[PDB]
Design a protein around this ligand. Sequence first.
Ligand SMILES: *Cc1cc2c(cc1C)nc1c(=O)[nH]c(=O)nc-1n2C[C@H](O)[C@H](O)[C@H](O)COP(=O)(O)OP(=O)(O)OC[C@H]1O[C@@H](n2cnc3c(N)ncnc32)[C@H](O)[C@@H]1O
Length: 530
Amino acid sequence: MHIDNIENLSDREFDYIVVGGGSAGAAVAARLSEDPAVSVALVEAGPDDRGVPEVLQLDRWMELLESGYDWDYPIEPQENGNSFMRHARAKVMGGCSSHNACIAFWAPREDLDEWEAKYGATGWNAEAAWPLYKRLETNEDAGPDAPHHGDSGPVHLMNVPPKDPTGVALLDACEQAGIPRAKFNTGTTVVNGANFFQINRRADGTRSSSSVSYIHPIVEQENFTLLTGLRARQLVFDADRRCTGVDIVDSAFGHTHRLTARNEVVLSTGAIDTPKLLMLSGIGPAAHLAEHGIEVLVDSPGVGEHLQDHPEGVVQFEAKQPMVAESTQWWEIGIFTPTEDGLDRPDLMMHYGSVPFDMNTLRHGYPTTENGFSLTPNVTHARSRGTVRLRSRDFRDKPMVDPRYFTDPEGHDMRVMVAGIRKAREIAAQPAMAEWTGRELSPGVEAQTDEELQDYIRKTHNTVYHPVGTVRMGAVEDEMSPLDPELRVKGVTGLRVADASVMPEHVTVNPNITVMMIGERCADLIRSAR
Ligand SMILES: *Cc1cc2c(cc1C)nc1c(=O)[nH]c(=O)nc-1n2C[C@H](O)[C@H](O)[C@H](O)COP(=O)(O)OP(=O)(O)OC[C@H]1O[C@@H](n2cnc3c(N)ncnc32)[C@H](O)[C@@H]1O
């Protein structure tokens, strides 16, 4: 049953509570709820997504940015970046899977294997991720000639139909440049290749959010409870240090009620909010909890540390012909290409947008258009690391988000971005794009030296919106990993984190589906007891 007002709930005791019904949370709730003996509560701050159509309908997605469905987290001033950047974060069931561009990717096997081998995450590798990626999808490419794909899973993945004439040409220009067409999600990582994406979206136009995919169909289920418009402010523990529940609130200035957990709590409030909530609950770097008068329950110096993203740049063009006026999601093509020899993963990616993207350029006096396209290079494995810290001990204050863009001491992320800009310029200048490529609007042909292009990037870069790493897994000996390999918070019991926070290292690709995968795994971990 769905509860929109906490007063209607008479039992606040549950076997499992899952906080935050986003990409991972929904999934873990949906899966845990499959044993009908066991009871499950899933608590989210945003509202229900059913009958909301700015959320349900994918081609509308961009309209959600900065709306009442976005938490809207601006960043701290940047040493070497764009101080006007906002990390949009969906606030609604399905979380960011309800506002994202639905671009769907298996993570590369070399990303996931490195979790175990390079980063201490025992049991986190491809053998583990592969049967789960399988389970979560109903993929168009399923067949005997692609047995790695699942055919009956909740999240519908479809191939984007190659209809955009500029899209098709951009590919033709890509071939001309040394970038072949590749199939996505075949099991073999794409290093140098490009194509129309797969997307997680149903036949009708409705996105395949983790809420549309996992929750909707189980709403009326006997053992499962959906609490929405409820915000968590604290986790609650024992003299034994077993997590017993969570305190939540009906409007911010309204009251505080406690749901209690017989078995476990799962935090799935994502890369920005999970570390906040843990710190408000006494779990983090001690000196920092001391700074704000939060009493320390566990000194865990790694909470809110290791913030990772895909920084994004942009290169904008005037179209010589008219652009498409309908799309799946306006960003239909992706391009991988290495900048360096010897990599088993591309260090550079570019999306293609059949629209302008003047979010960060307008305020800087760069001219625009209503008829053009964009090329958006991103660093797939940035070496900059940042933080999420508390602004105060007040749960209502937004956290301080400081990804510290382009601060890696080697100057690598800047170097990949500079090169990405150059490459996008190169792709567009190709003969298969003579009929389309017009005048370059930003940064404008004017900018040519490493130095000029750097300045443009520092001013005008965005994010692809993939913040991760902030409550990371790792070895049991590693003091700097808040979680052990089975997703349990150290120094406490009965508490696990399951969302983008847990990544020891970013993945190469748009991470949503990988986050959905993580929830699946956590579900399997929890329900493997025993
Ligand atoms: C937001 C964004 C991200 C995005 C994207 C475009 C935008 C604008 N495009 C993507 C794409 O095309 N393909 C892809 O692979 N990823 C894309 N993303 C990023 C991706 O969507 C996210 O990385 C992924 O969604 C992360 O999921 P995660 O489970 O880690 O976090 P979440 O989805 O944001 O879920 C958190 C939920 O919990 C609620 N919440 C937050 N705080 C509280 C409190 N205190 N109490 C109760 N609930 C809380 C949030 O509202 C959210 O629903």
